[PDB]
Amino acid sequence: IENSAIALSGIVSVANNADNRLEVFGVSTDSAVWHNWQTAPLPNSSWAGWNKFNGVVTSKPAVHRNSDGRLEVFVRGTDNALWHNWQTAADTNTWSSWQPLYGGITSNPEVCLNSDGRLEVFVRGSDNALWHIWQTAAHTNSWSNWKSLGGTLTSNPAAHLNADGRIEVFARGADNALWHIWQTAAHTDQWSNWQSLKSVITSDPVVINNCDGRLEVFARGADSTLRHISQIGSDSVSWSNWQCLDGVITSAPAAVKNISGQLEVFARGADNTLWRTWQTSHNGPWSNWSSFTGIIASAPTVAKNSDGRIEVFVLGLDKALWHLWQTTSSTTSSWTTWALIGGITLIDASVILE
Amino acid sequence: IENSAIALSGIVSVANNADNRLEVFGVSTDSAVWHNWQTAPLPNSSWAGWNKFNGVVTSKPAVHRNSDGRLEVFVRGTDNALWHNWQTAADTNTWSSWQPLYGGITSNPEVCLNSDGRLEVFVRGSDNALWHIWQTAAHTNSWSNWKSLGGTLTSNPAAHLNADGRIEVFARGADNALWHIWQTAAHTDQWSNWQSLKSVITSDPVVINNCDGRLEVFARGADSTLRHISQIGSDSVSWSNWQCLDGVITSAPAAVKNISGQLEVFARGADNTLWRTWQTSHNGPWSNWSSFTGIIASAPTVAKNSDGRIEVFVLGLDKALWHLWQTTSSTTSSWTTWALIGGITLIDASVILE
Amino acid sequence: IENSAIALSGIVSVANNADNRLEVFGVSTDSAVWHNWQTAPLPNSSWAGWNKFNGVVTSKPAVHRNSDGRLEVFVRGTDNALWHNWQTAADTNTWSSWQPLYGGITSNPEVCLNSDGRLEVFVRGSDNALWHIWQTAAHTNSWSNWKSLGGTLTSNPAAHLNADGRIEVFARGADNALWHIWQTAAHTDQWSNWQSLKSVITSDPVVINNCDGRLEVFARGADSTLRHISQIGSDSVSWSNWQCLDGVITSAPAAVKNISGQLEVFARGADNTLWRTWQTSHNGPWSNWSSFTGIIASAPTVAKNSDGRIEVFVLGLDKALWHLWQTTSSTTSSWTTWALIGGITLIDASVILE
Amino acid sequence: IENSAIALSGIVSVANNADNRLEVFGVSTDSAVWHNWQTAPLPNSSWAGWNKFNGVVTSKPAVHRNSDGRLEVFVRGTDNALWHNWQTAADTNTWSSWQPLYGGITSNPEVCLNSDGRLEVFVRGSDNALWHIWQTAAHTNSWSNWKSLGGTLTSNPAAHLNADGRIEVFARGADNALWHIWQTAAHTDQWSNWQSLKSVITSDPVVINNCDGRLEVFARGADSTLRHISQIGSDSVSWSNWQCLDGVITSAPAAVKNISGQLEVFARGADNTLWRTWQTSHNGPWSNWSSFTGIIASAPTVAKNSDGRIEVFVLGLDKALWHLWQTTSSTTSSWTTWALIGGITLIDASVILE
């Protein structure tokens, strides 16, 4: 493993609809985005079937729910520009056609929802800097001009809200270390300078908030194990030391907070099966990795259902989408075995960063 | 203080719009509902001014945001039936006229949002039982028939979601004790039997969730001090003992979780000023009560702004609405002094339960 | 229940020998101190049998282990002066005769071990002030002169070390409130002024340290329920609000930290049986009281064995000493039923404070 | 760094006397054990001066306080047998001459105090197995015969009590992994089988208990960073995954629990200065390493004074003993700079394990 490697990513993007039904977005062999959704917001629900958005795309799709409940998808087009399309009403399967946001992007798009209800998109630009564009009014198809935040990115960006509403963005830099930059006031265009968090990383960063309000960042390290760092104060400049966990992982990690408020991390393990680790107590030590039966061909994508149950999506060896879930809304629940969401095969359309 | 007393309630109901701007609803001297809203989602924002909904009402209004971002208000009419009106689009100040939901109600209405996106309303009925009615599809003006959950209520009901999506409802019973009843599966019409939590209470119950997922209930006790009880397991049947805190309070309490994940409680104190107490550590002991200058004439109503800052609304001695807020997004922030939201005077339209 | 009442106390004092065998001290119908000890440091051990110290006493005996492992007992004599006697070697049943420390005392004695190895005794004096006397060298029969700390005491004193080695003393004052006073530097004769913790109490105070280093104080309140308060900072002046727990208790409480670091409290309940409550999580909420079968005639005295198992001693209706213990070294262990430590009957020799 | 390396150890062993004065034991250029002690139990106390025990030794000395307060030192002699000598009374500077315990030992000795007051010594034997010998009565010069616990050791052993009084012993095995073995009942000669904790380690293991009762083990790993693992249940068989902390260390670590109950770790860092890291919250994340000025030539040895203040001892470049300490009994206290405990120079007499 080399310092500039980027671990295998998830094969779909997932979102909860306004009524919390899960909906997945991926790219098929026709290079178009397809999507599928639960018919009811429970993991054992039937799925509607795969439906196509017309248009050829050249990145992994990113999806986020607007503050009025409508899903909106962002993707790079054949012109290397940003395109988006949206549900025309919450919980409806009527969509716009792809609409242009222009620009020139060289990474997958990352979408955040500001705490004033406005979507904001972060991408690597043609000059390898971080660029962003935002809705100028909440849940409205009115966007700003493109603006640069500088820097030099060698991974996809990952964005998350701090507890006080300030967006913070994480990305690997030219030295293969994790860097970050943040709004200095909530949902405004006033930003810090770039700062290094020092450690080399070999995956995109994955960010989650704990109960205490503080951000935690997970990534694969140079020795191919999971490592993590967390905010220790009230601001974006006070961080812990990095810690690693034993166990070689072969994909990006995926993190989720269970309904007991504890963190869980999923990743493809050294034997190409799905591995899971969880915090055993508040802030506590981490469990040994547990493995699920079955070889997988992507990183996991993890979501929560309306009753709190965790559900995991992966690419199978047959190049189709599989999933499994918790049988009960309990931290020690047993899990189902992999089930197929059949109808199309999927490709990894992630932008090749080099 | 007698066992059947119900402490003074808050004078307004508050909600966050889809873009997180606060909006308050109260009843004026014309017995109509009026509302006012922030023009931007920050506590130092200007307010738009008081606007009237036509129609005479006979209860405190209850407000909740739909899963598509539209606010919806519920109130008892002059016919003792339930009426509602809604924003016709998220973050817009265009409303329906009051529309009928019928029934016969003898308490203030309480509204909950199920985790599948459907609003559900709980009221005491003409037979003193708990009744409820729900949207049959998420964020849609299609409602069920009225259905009884039984029991005998001597307070307004308070409802909250468990971490697994099950609604749980709390209300004082015929013996002046706190009782509760819960969905046995998330967002379904399958309910438990009524169970007593034993302690006498002299206010409506106030329910909040902690980070661990568990519900905590606050109420005034028979000796006029604050008392509280919390779930200790994974279900609705395992509760702690009751604990009281020293200090006589003269209103219902209001509880909020700050951005550090700790709980804070506000109440009118024995000297008729606003009092505040907070948890000093995770699950920790509670601080001595702190007082704010100024005599108040209602219980506090507490809300959070888009940047996490807590804001408190009270009725002043001039019968107008006043508010104060935290100066910074920090747990140890200083507070502003009371400021007026002028333009109308307010009355307490709470249903007299005896 | 009146504000000046002092709840029933424990009938024996207990200590661990240098090898951790438990040894109990009580007063029999001959007004002499008798003692009995485990033959091995396990709760199911046989006991040696009751042995008498010659001499008539007029208070409950207090016992503490010296820093060289020798037990030492303190008691008021027929002359109202303080007397003491000691093991002449650790884990040996050879004792000195009662030896005089003079003074004039009007409460039971309370003994503390300073963190520099010197015993220090606290008593109410003939002028109702707090007085103390100390070893001038660790584990040596060389004592200081008597010195007054002032104040007005209406309970027995309770002393405990802070985490930094400063002794802090708690006692009810003339206004029936809990007061305290503390060393301002570890194991030195430099003391603070008296300060009130405000709440009325109707038992002696009981003090324990939690894992965080902080002191917690338990007492019965004016409504005959358990109440407690805890340090919230790094010093002796920052305390939480008082909290009460529901449930009427009819004796002083006894507190212990179990081997999981959680606190447990035992007391005689409203039905004259032994009641137990425990913290369900770190700093967490408290369980409902659980009852053990059997009417008891004293407060419990609680100790821990060499394997961590909790053991409880009480006076039975037959005026003899009974005990029960945990069956395993686990927080959720079951308990044995009461067993007799037969051979003498015991009287409550506690000094009548009025 | 190779898998079989054993990091540099501390240059002295330290103990608290019965009155909590610190006393240090090391080996000088004459191959004899010398010791020095505080004259009062405070870090700014003067020290008595270096005093010699007659006799040539061939290991680092181990010291433990007996349950009657007397210090006792264990060391390998020129005959490769175990020898010991003891204070003849607590807090006295009168010692026995070295007395024989025989055996054949190939590591430094490790001493534990059972919870029934009996010392027990663990050593690697001439067959590379773990051997032990124990006092047959508490604080008495009567010892058992030597007994083997089997295994194959490639480090010195480290022993610690579990919260329930069971001794647990940790040592590196033939595969360079950390192994452990434990008493299955407190202070009895009934032991488990050896079990692997799997990770390679390149230092002796260092064991400490947290507040929750659970053991935590620290060691240097194969990549020369600090790693740690902790018990997650009520027994000796349930452990967390291993975690590493960033930062190359060049000595064994030393761990201590501060008076707030949080853990701190000291080690020589990659630049040969003393480094310190601490837990920022309960169980929490670990701080970045902080450095103290001054090149050091051993691992640190860490102790606590009677007022809770941490004190650290190291070998200086002048081959003399230096120390520094906290200025106040507070977790965020500043520290003094290195001060000399002059009078002799010290050598590292640690047994060469290969």
Side-chain angles (χ1 to χ4, degrees), chain D residues 296-321:
Chain D
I296 65 175
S298 69
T301 302
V302 183
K304 284 200 281 184
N305 282 269
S306 69
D307 60 4
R309 284 189 281 169
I310 295 167
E311 184 163 351
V312 182
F313 302 86
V314 300
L315 187 68
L317 285 173
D318 61 354
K319 294 182 191 332
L321 188 64

PDB file of all heavy atoms in Angstrom, chain D residues 296-321:
ATOM      1  N   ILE D 296      16.730  12.670  28.230  1.00  0.00           N
ATOM      2  CA  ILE D 296      16.729  11.681  29.299  1.00  0.00           C
ATOM      3  C   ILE D 296      17.272  10.361  28.766  1.00  0.00           C
ATOM      4  O   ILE D 296      17.265  10.084  27.559  1.00  0.00           O
ATOM      5  CB  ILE D 296      15.328  11.499  29.927  1.00  0.00           C
ATOM      6  CG1 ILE D 296      14.355  10.909  28.899  1.00  0.00           C
ATOM      7  CG2 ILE D 296      14.813  12.834  30.455  1.00  0.00           C
ATOM      8  CD1 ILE D 296      12.975  10.585  29.463  1.00  0.00           C
ATOM      9  N   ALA D 297      17.770   9.538  29.693  1.00  0.00           N
ATOM     10  CA  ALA D 297      18.520   8.340  29.339  1.00  0.00           C
ATOM     11  C   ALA D 297      17.888   7.069  29.890  1.00  0.00           C
ATOM     12  O   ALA D 297      18.544   6.026  29.936  1.00  0.00           O
ATOM     13  CB  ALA D 297      19.973   8.460  29.818  1.00  0.00           C
ATOM     14  N   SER D 298      16.623   7.131  30.304  1.00  0.00           N
ATOM     15  CA  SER D 298      15.899   5.948  30.744  1.00  0.00           C
ATOM     16  C   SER D 298      14.428   6.163  30.433  1.00  0.00           C
ATOM     17  O   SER D 298      14.015   7.260  30.045  1.00  0.00           O
ATOM     18  CB  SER D 298      16.096   5.691  32.246  1.00  0.00           C
ATOM     19  OG  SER D 298      15.439   6.685  33.010  1.00  0.00           O
ATOM     20  N   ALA D 299      13.631   5.115  30.630  1.00  0.00           N
ATOM     21  CA  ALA D 299      12.191   5.327  30.717  1.00  0.00           C
ATOM     22  C   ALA D 299      11.876   6.107  31.989  1.00  0.00           C
ATOM     23  O   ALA D 299      12.653   6.087  32.944  1.00  0.00           O
ATOM     24  CB  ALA D 299      11.452   3.993  30.730  1.00  0.00           C
ATOM     25  N   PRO D 300      10.738   6.793  32.038  1.00  0.00           N
ATOM     26  CA  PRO D 300      10.319   7.425  33.292  1.00  0.00           C
ATOM     27  C   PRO D 300       9.784   6.402  34.277  1.00  0.00           C
ATOM     28  O   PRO D 300       9.259   5.351  33.901  1.00  0.00           O
ATOM     29  CB  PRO D 300       9.201   8.379  32.858  1.00  0.00           C
ATOM     30  CG  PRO D 300       8.633   7.724  31.619  1.00  0.00           C
ATOM     31  CD  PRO D 300       9.793   7.044  30.932  1.00  0.00           C
ATOM     32  N   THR D 301       9.941   6.724  35.557  1.00  0.00           N
ATOM     33  CA  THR D 301       9.250   6.040  36.644  1.00  0.00           C
ATOM     34  C   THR D 301       8.363   7.084  37.298  1.00  0.00           C
ATOM     35  O   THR D 301       8.832   8.180  37.616  1.00  0.00           O
ATOM     36  CB  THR D 301      10.239   5.445  37.662  1.00  0.00           C
ATOM     37  OG1 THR D 301      11.117   4.527  37.002  1.00  0.00           O
ATOM     38  CG2 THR D 301       9.491   4.716  38.772  1.00  0.00           C
ATOM     39  N   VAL D 302       7.084   6.756  37.503  1.00  0.00           N
ATOM     40  CA  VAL D 302       6.083   7.738  37.908  1.00  0.00           C
ATOM     41  C   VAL D 302       5.456   7.328  39.235  1.00  0.00           C
ATOM     42  O   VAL D 302       5.139   6.150  39.443  1.00  0.00           O
ATOM     43  CB  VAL D 302       5.002   7.894  36.817  1.00  0.00           C
ATOM     44  CG1 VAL D 302       4.013   8.973  37.207  1.00  0.00           C
ATOM     45  CG2 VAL D 302       5.657   8.215  35.479  1.00  0.00           C
ATOM     46  N   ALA D 303       5.252   8.309  40.120  1.00  0.00           N
ATOM     47  CA  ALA D 303       4.712   8.068  41.449  1.00  0.00           C
ATOM     48  C   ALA D 303       3.783   9.214  41.803  1.00  0.00           C
ATOM     49  O   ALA D 303       3.787  10.262  41.160  1.00  0.00           O
ATOM     50  CB  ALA D 303       5.832   7.940  42.490  1.00  0.00           C
ATOM     51  N   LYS D 304       2.987   9.015  42.852  1.00  0.00           N
ATOM     52  CA  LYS D 304       2.103  10.059  43.350  1.00  0.00           C
ATOM     53  C   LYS D 304       2.436  10.355  44.804  1.00  0.00           C
ATOM     54  O   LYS D 304       2.694   9.441  45.593  1.00  0.00           O
ATOM     55  CB  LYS D 304       0.622   9.661  43.231  1.00  0.00           C
ATOM     56  CG  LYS D 304       0.067   9.761  41.821  1.00  0.00           C
ATOM     57  CD  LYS D 304      -1.456   9.842  41.832  1.00  0.00           C
ATOM     58  CE  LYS D 304      -2.073   8.478  42.042  1.00  0.00           C
ATOM     59  NZ  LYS D 304      -3.552   8.567  41.958  1.00  0.00           N
ATOM     60  N   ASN D 305       2.417  11.632  45.151  1.00  0.00           N
ATOM     61  CA  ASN D 305       2.681  12.091  46.504  1.00  0.00           C
ATOM     62  C   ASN D 305       1.414  12.071  47.356  1.00  0.00           C
ATOM     63  O   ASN D 305       0.307  11.808  46.877  1.00  0.00           O
ATOM     64  CB  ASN D 305       3.270  13.500  46.464  1.00  0.00           C
ATOM     65  CG  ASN D 305       4.731  13.496  46.090  1.00  0.00           C
ATOM     66  OD1 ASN D 305       5.592  13.426  46.963  1.00  0.00           O
ATOM     67  ND2 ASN D 305       5.025  13.544  44.791  1.00  0.00           N
ATOM     68  N   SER D 306       1.583  12.372  48.650  1.00  0.00           N
ATOM     69  CA  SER D 306       0.455  12.280  49.571  1.00  0.00           C
ATOM     70  C   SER D 306      -0.643  13.278  49.254  1.00  0.00           C
ATOM     71  O   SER D 306      -1.779  13.095  49.707  1.00  0.00           O
ATOM     72  CB  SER D 306       0.927  12.493  51.013  1.00  0.00           C
ATOM     73  OG  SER D 306       1.324  13.847  51.218  1.00  0.00           O
ATOM     74  N   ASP D 307      -0.341  14.334  48.499  1.00  0.00           N
ATOM     75  CA  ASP D 307      -1.355  15.310  48.132  1.00  0.00           C
ATOM     76  C   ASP D 307      -1.834  15.116  46.701  1.00  0.00           C
ATOM     77  O   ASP D 307      -2.503  15.996  46.151  1.00  0.00           O
ATOM     78  CB  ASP D 307      -0.826  16.730  48.348  1.00  0.00           C
ATOM     79  CG  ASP D 307       0.421  17.028  47.529  1.00  0.00           C
ATOM     80  OD1 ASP D 307       0.843  16.172  46.727  1.00  0.00           O
ATOM     81  OD2 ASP D 307       0.993  18.122  47.709  1.00  0.00           O
ATOM     82  N   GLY D 308      -1.517  13.974  46.099  1.00  0.00           N
ATOM     83  CA  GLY D 308      -1.979  13.638  44.768  1.00  0.00           C
ATOM     84  C   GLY D 308      -1.069  14.076  43.644  1.00  0.00           C
ATOM     85  O   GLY D 308      -1.301  13.681  42.494  1.00  0.00           O
ATOM     86  N   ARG D 309      -0.036  14.861  43.929  1.00  0.00           N
ATOM     87  CA  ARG D 309       0.782  15.412  42.859  1.00  0.00           C
ATOM     88  C   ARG D 309       1.695  14.349  42.261  1.00  0.00           C
ATOM     89  O   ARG D 309       2.350  13.591  42.985  1.00  0.00           O
ATOM     90  CB  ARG D 309       1.597  16.593  43.370  1.00  0.00           C
ATOM     91  CG  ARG D 309       0.726  17.827  43.532  1.00  0.00           C
ATOM     92  CD  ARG D 309       1.559  19.044  43.815  1.00  0.00           C
ATOM     93  NE  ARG D 309       1.971  19.110  45.207  1.00  0.00           N
ATOM     94  CZ  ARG D 309       2.879  19.966  45.667  1.00  0.00           C
ATOM     95  NH1 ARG D 309       3.484  20.801  44.830  1.00  0.00           N
ATOM     96  NH2 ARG D 309       3.190  19.980  46.955  1.00  0.00           N
ATOM     97  N   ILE D 310       1.741  14.311  40.933  1.00  0.00           N
ATOM     98  CA  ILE D 310       2.538  13.341  40.189  1.00  0.00           C
ATOM     99  C   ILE D 310       3.990  13.788  40.168  1.00  0.00           C
ATOM    100  O   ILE D 310       4.290  14.976  40.010  1.00  0.00           O
ATOM    101  CB  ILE D 310       1.994  13.183  38.759  1.00  0.00           C
ATOM    102  CG1 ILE D 310       0.595  12.586  38.801  1.00  0.00           C
ATOM    103  CG2 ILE D 310       2.897  12.288  37.919  1.00  0.00           C
ATOM    104  CD1 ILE D 310      -0.137  12.678  37.462  1.00  0.00           C
ATOM    105  N   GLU D 311       4.889  12.823  40.311  1.00  0.00           N
ATOM    106  CA  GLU D 311       6.324  13.055  40.307  1.00  0.00           C
ATOM    107  C   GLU D 311       6.970  12.020  39.395  1.00  0.00           C
ATOM    108  O   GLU D 311       6.572  10.853  39.386  1.00  0.00           O
ATOM    109  CB  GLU D 311       6.868  12.970  41.746  1.00  0.00           C
ATOM    110  CG  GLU D 311       8.342  13.277  41.906  1.00  0.00           C
ATOM    111  CD  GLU D 311       8.725  13.569  43.346  1.00  0.00           C
ATOM    112  OE1 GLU D 311       7.822  13.708  44.203  1.00  0.00           O
ATOM    113  OE2 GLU D 311       9.946  13.676  43.627  1.00  0.00           O
ATOM    114  N   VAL D 312       7.949  12.449  38.603  1.00  0.00           N
ATOM    115  CA  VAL D 312       8.553  11.605  37.575  1.00  0.00           C
ATOM    116  C   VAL D 312      10.056  11.565  37.807  1.00  0.00           C
ATOM    117  O   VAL D 312      10.673  12.609  38.039  1.00  0.00           O
ATOM    118  CB  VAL D 312       8.260  12.134  36.157  1.00  0.00           C
ATOM    119  CG1 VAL D 312       8.853  11.204  35.117  1.00  0.00           C
ATOM    120  CG2 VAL D 312       6.746  12.337  35.958  1.00  0.00           C
ATOM    121  N   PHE D 313      10.634  10.368  37.733  1.00  0.00           N
ATOM    122  CA  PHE D 313      12.060  10.124  37.930  1.00  0.00           C
ATOM    123  C   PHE D 313      12.665   9.582  36.646  1.00  0.00           C
ATOM    124  O   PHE D 313      12.078   8.701  36.001  1.00  0.00           O
ATOM    125  CB  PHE D 313      12.301   9.106  39.067  1.00  0.00           C
ATOM    126  CG  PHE D 313      11.719   9.520  40.380  1.00  0.00           C
ATOM    127  CD1 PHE D 313      10.399   9.236  40.695  1.00  0.00           C
ATOM    128  CD2 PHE D 313      12.499  10.183  41.322  1.00  0.00           C
ATOM    129  CE1 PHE D 313       9.864   9.626  41.907  1.00  0.00           C
ATOM    130  CE2 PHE D 313      11.969  10.571  42.532  1.00  0.00           C
ATOM    131  CZ  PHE D 313      10.654  10.294  42.830  1.00  0.00           C
ATOM    132  N   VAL D 314      13.846  10.091  36.273  1.00  0.00           N
ATOM    133  CA  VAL D 314      14.533   9.640  35.065  1.00  0.00           C
ATOM    134  C   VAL D 314      16.031   9.662  35.309  1.00  0.00           C
ATOM    135  O   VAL D 314      16.529  10.363  36.190  1.00  0.00           O
ATOM    136  CB  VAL D 314      14.240  10.498  33.809  1.00  0.00           C
ATOM    137  CG1 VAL D 314      12.757  10.504  33.464  1.00  0.00           C
ATOM    138  CG2 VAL D 314      14.777  11.901  33.990  1.00  0.00           C
ATOM    139  N   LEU D 315      16.748   8.888  34.501  1.00  0.00           N
ATOM    140  CA  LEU D 315      18.203   8.973  34.440  1.00  0.00           C
ATOM    141  C   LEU D 315      18.598  10.120  33.520  1.00  0.00           C
ATOM    142  O   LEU D 315      18.076  10.236  32.406  1.00  0.00           O
ATOM    143  CB  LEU D 315      18.786   7.665  33.918  1.00  0.00           C
ATOM    144  CG  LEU D 315      20.311   7.599  33.988  1.00  0.00           C
ATOM    145  CD1 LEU D 315      20.721   7.539  35.442  1.00  0.00           C
ATOM    146  CD2 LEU D 315      20.807   6.397  33.213  1.00  0.00           C
ATOM    147  N   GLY D 316      19.515  10.977  33.985  1.00  0.00           N
ATOM    148  CA  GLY D 316      20.015  12.055  33.154  1.00  0.00           C
ATOM    149  C   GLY D 316      21.242  11.638  32.354  1.00  0.00           C
ATOM    150  O   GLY D 316      21.796  10.556  32.527  1.00  0.00           O
ATOM    151  N   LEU D 317      21.662  12.530  31.449  1.00  0.00           N
ATOM    152  CA  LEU D 317      22.859  12.272  30.656  1.00  0.00           C
ATOM    153  C   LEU D 317      24.105  12.176  31.520  1.00  0.00           C
ATOM    154  O   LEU D 317      25.089  11.557  31.101  1.00  0.00           O
ATOM    155  CB  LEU D 317      23.037  13.374  29.609  1.00  0.00           C
ATOM    156  CG  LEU D 317      22.083  13.272  28.424  1.00  0.00           C
ATOM    157  CD1 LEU D 317      22.199  14.496  27.525  1.00  0.00           C
ATOM    158  CD2 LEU D 317      22.370  11.996  27.658  1.00  0.00           C
ATOM    159  N   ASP D 318      24.085  12.776  32.711  1.00  0.00           N
ATOM    160  CA  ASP D 318      25.178  12.663  33.667  1.00  0.00           C
ATOM    161  C   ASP D 318      25.125  11.366  34.471  1.00  0.00           C
ATOM    162  O   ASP D 318      25.934  11.193  35.390  1.00  0.00           O
ATOM    163  CB  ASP D 318      25.182  13.874  34.605  1.00  0.00           C
ATOM    164  CG  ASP D 318      23.895  14.007  35.414  1.00  0.00           C
ATOM    165  OD1 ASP D 318      22.942  13.230  35.177  1.00  0.00           O
ATOM    166  OD2 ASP D 318      23.837  14.896  36.288  1.00  0.00           O
ATOM    167  N   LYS D 319      24.204  10.457  34.130  1.00  0.00           N
ATOM    168  CA  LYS D 319      24.013   9.173  34.803  1.00  0.00           C
ATOM    169  C   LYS D 319      23.549   9.335  36.245  1.00  0.00           C
ATOM    170  O   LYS D 319      23.682   8.407  37.052  1.00  0.00           O
ATOM    171  CB  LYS D 319      25.277   8.308  34.741  1.00  0.00           C
ATOM    172  CG  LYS D 319      25.635   7.872  33.324  1.00  0.00           C
ATOM    173  CD  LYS D 319      26.870   6.974  33.306  1.00  0.00           C
ATOM    174  CE  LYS D 319      27.395   6.750  31.890  1.00  0.00           C
ATOM    175  NZ  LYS D 319      26.327   6.854  30.854  1.00  0.00           N
ATOM    176  N   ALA D 320      22.977  10.480  36.585  1.00  0.00           N
ATOM    177  CA  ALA D 320      22.392  10.692  37.900  1.00  0.00           C
ATOM    178  C   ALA D 320      20.870  10.725  37.799  1.00  0.00           C
ATOM    179  O   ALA D 320      20.293  10.825  36.714  1.00  0.00           O
ATOM    180  CB  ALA D 320      22.916  11.986  38.524  1.00  0.00           C
ATOM    181  N   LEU D 321      20.225  10.628  38.956  1.00  0.00           N
ATOM    182  CA  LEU D 321      18.766  10.612  39.036  1.00  0.00           C
ATOM    183  C   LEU D 321      18.219  12.032  39.074  1.00  0.00           C
ATOM    184  O   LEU D 321      18.616  12.836  39.925  1.00  0.00           O
ATOM    185  CB  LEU D 321      18.306   9.857  40.287  1.00  0.00           C
ATOM    186  CG  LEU D 321      16.795   9.607  40.370  1.00  0.00           C
ATOM    187  CD1 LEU D 321      16.339   8.697  39.230  1.00  0.00           C
ATOM    188  CD2 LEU D 321      16.456   9.020  41.728  1.00  0.00           C
TER     189      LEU D 321
END
